[PDB]
Design an enzyme around this catalytic site. Structure first.
Site, PDB file in Angstrom:
ATOM      1  N   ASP A 152      12.626 -38.789  22.440  1.00 47.77           N
ATOM      2  CA  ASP A 152      11.341 -39.437  22.171  1.00 47.77           C
ATOM      3  C   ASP A 152      11.571 -40.773  21.481  1.00 47.77           C
ATOM      4  O   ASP A 152      10.955 -41.091  20.465  1.00 47.77           O
ATOM      5  CB  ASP A 152      10.422 -38.537  21.339  1.00 47.77           C
ATOM      6  N   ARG A 156       7.135 -46.164  17.586  1.00 45.61           N
ATOM      7  CA  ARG A 156       6.413 -45.328  16.629  1.00 45.61           C
ATOM      8  C   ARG A 156       7.333 -44.369  15.879  1.00 45.61           C
ATOM      9  O   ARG A 156       6.959 -43.887  14.802  1.00 45.61           O
ATOM     10  CB  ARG A 156       5.319 -44.525  17.341  1.00 45.61           C
ATOM     11  N   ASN A 157       8.514 -44.069  16.419  1.00 46.51           N
ATOM     12  CA  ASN A 157       9.438 -43.135  15.787  1.00 46.51           C
ATOM     13  C   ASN A 157      10.564 -43.821  15.025  1.00 46.51           C
ATOM     14  O   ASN A 157      11.459 -43.137  14.517  1.00 46.51           O
ATOM     15  CB  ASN A 157      10.035 -42.189  16.833  1.00 46.51           C
ATOM     16  N   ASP A 170      12.410 -39.430  14.181  1.00 43.90           N
ATOM     17  CA  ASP A 170      11.522 -38.687  15.076  1.00 43.90           C
ATOM     18  C   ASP A 170      10.551 -37.897  14.205  1.00 43.90           C
ATOM     19  O   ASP A 170      10.971 -36.961  13.523  1.00 43.90           O
ATOM     20  CB  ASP A 170      12.327 -37.763  15.987  1.00 43.90           C
TER      21      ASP A 170
END
Ligand SMILES: O=C(Nc1ccc(F)cc1)C1(C(=O)Nc2ccc(Oc3ccnc4c3Oc3ccccc3N4)c(F)c2)CC1
Length: 284
Positions: A152, A156-157, A170
């Site tokens: 992922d 945003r992570n 994450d």
């Protein structure tokens, strides 16, 4: 929680990174975020010398499902040996008599990278943004060397500390503080959209999308594409467009990251080298 019901190898790993409850003060009045499965608070960790360490304290909302508790602890254990300046580190795990176990992370002053570059009060230059992408590539080069597949990777992570060092991370169970078996399909490689399997080469595709996020200062990718139609959209012969301030060689790197054949996408080692060179051509 009843530790005896958990996997013994998991519990042993947790005890190697345990933080005594009396060394951790959770500031429940200072909430960083709340989601469906978890929440995050500001905290103060005291070391053996009494020095106060500003931390983020991640918690579950409920402790009644052994699967959620085991997964929550496993997320922390997965991190425990990450030691690299561009990867978020684990301060430890606090097991308490009552309530959720606590995953303790060093506090990241500037939050996540996507919100940072979207904040109109900051003014990163093109070189700064490329530098952020280079740092992510360095963190992923480290993780790939450990044969760790992120699955992922996205702005945003990634977190940003007080020195504007980017830390790959994450949010995990706290990611809901988009996804549509909730998958970040607009960051996913074509083969992962079709098989839901992930590799370091599909992390490379996601990294290319992250570069596009950086060069657009956090625009949503494919804004006019329905989430369930992204596979059809890509298979029509399409890629994200070159952002106006993205240098041509960096867009070429993006296109390589989105190679239709996973095996032909560049390694993170190659990406670090290539982006280092592009970065170095900028005065500021
Ligand atoms: O990262 C992880 N695993 C992993 C996987 C792959 C990898 F390569 C590296 C790491 C895990 C995790 O839980 N990660 C996690 C990240 C960020 C968090 O939020 C923080 C953390 C610190 N300070 C900030 C806070 O959020 C903010 C928001 C707004 C303003 C300011 C802050 N401050 C958090 F609570 C937890 C799953 C174990």
């Amino acid at each position: 929680i009843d530790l005896s019901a958990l996997n013994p190898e998991l519990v042993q790993a947790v005890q190697h990174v345990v933080i005594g409850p009396s060394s951790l003060i959770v500031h429940f009045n200072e909430v960083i975020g709340r989601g469906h499965f978890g929440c995050v608070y500001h905290g103060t960790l005291l070391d053996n010398d009494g020095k106060k360490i500003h931390c983020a304290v991640k918690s579950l909302n409920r402790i009644t499902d052994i699967g959620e508790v085991s997964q929550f602890l496993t997320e922390g254990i997965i991190m425990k040996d990450f030691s690299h300046p561009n990867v978020l580190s684990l301060l430890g795990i606090c097991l308490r008599s009552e309530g959720s176990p606590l995953v303790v992370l060093p506090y990241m002053k500037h939050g996540d990278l996507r919100n940072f570059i979207r904040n109109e009060t900051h003014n990163p230059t093109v070189k700064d943004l490329i530098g952020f992408g280079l740092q992510v590539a360095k963190g992923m080069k480290y993780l790939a060397s450990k044969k760790f597949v992120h699955r992922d990777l996205a702005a945003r992570n990634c977190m940003l500390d007080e020195k504007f060092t980017v830390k790959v991370a994450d949010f995990g169970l706290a990611r809901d503080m988009e996804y549509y078996a909730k998958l970040p399909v607009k960051w996913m490689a074509l083969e992962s959209l079709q098989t839901q399997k992930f590799t370091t080469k599909s992390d490379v595709w996601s990294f290319g999308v992250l570069l596009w996020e950086l060069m657009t200062r956090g625009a949503p990718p494919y804004p006019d594409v329905n989430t369930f139609d992204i596979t059809v959209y890509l298979l029509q012969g399409r890629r994200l467009l070159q952002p106006e301030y993205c240098p041509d060689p960096l867009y070429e790197v993006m296109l390589k990251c989105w190679h239709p054949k996973a095996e032909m996408r560049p390694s993170f080692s190659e990406l670090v080298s290539r982006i280092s060179a592009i970065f170095s051509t900028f005065i500021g």
